[PDB]
């Protein structure tokens, strides 16, 4: 999973390096071809069949990169689904928490033993569910489970007192229950809430960065087809005028430097995705 993610971005970075090396080699060949200012047909049909090779390989590399990007998106979606499940479990635990608090209020406001017993029954069911509602060997996790064990034990004590008609002892047991709950489960609750908020923020920023990365790839792909169109609108037409030629000679330089700006942006985005993922 995480190791697979690290391997993907690693190999995506490697593909990026290969496509920037191929581009700079093509630029060097074009420069060395057109410094001499040779209008021979053989050199054009060969030193631009150099552009043809670069585009054939670079396009295959782009296809591999697109497949890797789709796999990366699938893994990110799996991570987001795991975070969604954890948030749902946290919501269930908070619901059980609210049930416990409501029934503690009811016990405080109660006057007879039947109301106390009913509230304690609801508390016991909520505490059992909350203990089970957890996604895992951290010390806080163990303290949470042990605290719910003690909490259900205190519910047992309060129920035992209530079944004997001792309402005041039941309220006292509920107060000790509140103290135990605060001392044991509150820290885990705070940690889970903080983790869920941080994960929501991370999800938002990763949705933004992935969108930017997909846009960068599609933009680079659009530049590549423009490169082929320009080369053969100039290749097959066997152009001869030097002014028409020079103009193209710059068009491609500006297109190549724009592709550089795009490729370095892709590199920095991939480095960002790695840092945020570890």
């Amino acid at each position: 999973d995480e190791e697979r993610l690290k391997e993907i971005l690693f190999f995506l970075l490697l593909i990026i390096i290969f496509v920037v090396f191929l581009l700079i080699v093509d630029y060097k060949f074009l420069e060395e071809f057109k410094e001499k200012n040779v209008t021979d047909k053989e050199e054009f049909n060969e030193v631009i069949k150099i552009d043809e090779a670069v585009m054939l390989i670079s396009a295959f590399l782009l296809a591999i990169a697109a497949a890797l990007l789709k796999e990366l998106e699938e893994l990110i979606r799996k991570r987001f689904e795991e975070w969604e499940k954890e948030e749902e479990t946290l919501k269930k635990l908070e619901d059980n928490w609210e049930t416990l608090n409501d029934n503690l209020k009811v016990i405080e406001k109660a006057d007879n033993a039947a109301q106390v017993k009913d509230a304690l029954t609801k508390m016991r069911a909520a505490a059992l569910d909350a203990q089970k509602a957890t996604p895992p060997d951290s010390p806080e996790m163990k303290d949470f489970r042990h605290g719910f064990d003690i909490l259900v034990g205190q519910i047992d004590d309060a129920l035992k007192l209530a079944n004997e008609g001792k309402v005041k002892e039941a309220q006292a047991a509920a107060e000790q229950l509140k103290t135990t709950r605060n001392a044991y489960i509150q820290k885990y609750l705070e940690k889970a809430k903080e983790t869920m908020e941080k994960r929501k923020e991370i999800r938002r920023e990763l949705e933004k960065i992935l969108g930017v990365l997909a846009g960068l790839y599609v933009g680079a792909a659009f530049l590549m087809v423009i490169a082929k169109f320009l080369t053969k609108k100039i290749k097959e037409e066997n152009t001869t005028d030097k002014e028409k030629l020079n103009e193209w000679y710059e068009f491609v330089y500006v297109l190549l430097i724009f592709a550089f700006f795009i490729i370095l942006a892709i590199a920095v985005v991939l480095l960002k995705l790695l840092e945020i993922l570890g």
Partner: antibody
Framework: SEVQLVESGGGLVQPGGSLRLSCAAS????????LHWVRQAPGKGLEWVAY????????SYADSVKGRFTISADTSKNTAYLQMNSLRAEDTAVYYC?????????????????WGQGTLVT | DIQMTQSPSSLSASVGDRVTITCRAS??????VAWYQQKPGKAPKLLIY???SLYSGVPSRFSGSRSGTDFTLTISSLQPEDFATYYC??????????FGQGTKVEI
């Protein structure tokens, strides 16, 4: 090395009478298991009658039988007793005695893992 | 007082037919629901506890599931020794024990 519960003392009795059912436990002691009495009327379903926790002395009763039955225990001889008083026509049933572990852990979650053979009361 | 409503009150099935028994709790009892099997003239024995945990020695065909206050017992392959009365029982607390009405699976 077999955990079992054996019921005794049940049988035919006149209405309004008194009898002490006994549940003797072997393979385990009472002090770490609450003992519950559960009755099944002829052709009906199961119904929980009472329980006793000898560790804390707590006893609880079904509403249909509260005030008439008295559940007690003797850990020295490892037995539970149910004194049935003021018997009526709806008290005829097969009475089973079951063990239930204490909170927390698997013993509590296993519920009535072992049941007695049950004795008939008429 | 927690009611534990069991359906159906009785079902007829043959050997191999999948059997499903459903129980509804009048209020949340967590997963503190157990399924017991009872033969005619014998004491109930524990099949499932914690509403999904299979007791030791029970064939793995028996299974239990929970969905809110609904609890389901499933016999995947009804064997000839699987005809009996099955009881859902909530055990939230010692004094709050209530049983289902019982489903009489017969061959």
């Amino acid at each position: 090395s077999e955990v079992q519960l054996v019921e005794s003392g049940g049988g035919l009795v006149q209405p309004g009478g008194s009898l002490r059912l006994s549940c003797a436990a072997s393979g385990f002691n009472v002090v770490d298991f609450s003992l519950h009495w559960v009755r099944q009327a002829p052709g009906k379903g199961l119904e929980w009658v009472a329980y006793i926790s000898s560790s804390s002395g707590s006893t609880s009763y079904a509403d249909s039988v509260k005030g008439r039955f008295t559940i007690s225990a003797d850990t020295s001889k490892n037995t539970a007793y149910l004194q049935m008083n003021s018997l009526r026509a709806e008290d005829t049933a097969v009475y089973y005695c079951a063990r239930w572990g204490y909170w927390p852990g698997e013993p509590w979650w296993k519920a009535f893992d072992y049941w007695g053979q049950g004795t008939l009361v008429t | 007082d927690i009611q534990m409503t069991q359906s159906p009150s009785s079902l007829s099935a043959s050997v191999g037919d999948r059997v499903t028994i459903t129980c509804r709790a009048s209020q949340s009892v967590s997963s503190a629901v157990a399924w017991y099997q009872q033969k005619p003239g014998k004491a109930p024995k524990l099949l499932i506890y914690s509403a999904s945990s299979l007791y030791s020695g029970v064939p793995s065909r028996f299974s239990g599931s929970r969905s809110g206050t609904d609890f389901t017992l499933t016999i995947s392959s009804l064997q000839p020794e699987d005809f009996a009365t099955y009881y859902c029982q909530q055990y939230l607390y010692y004094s709050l024990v209530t049983f289902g009405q019982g489903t009489k699976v017969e061959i």
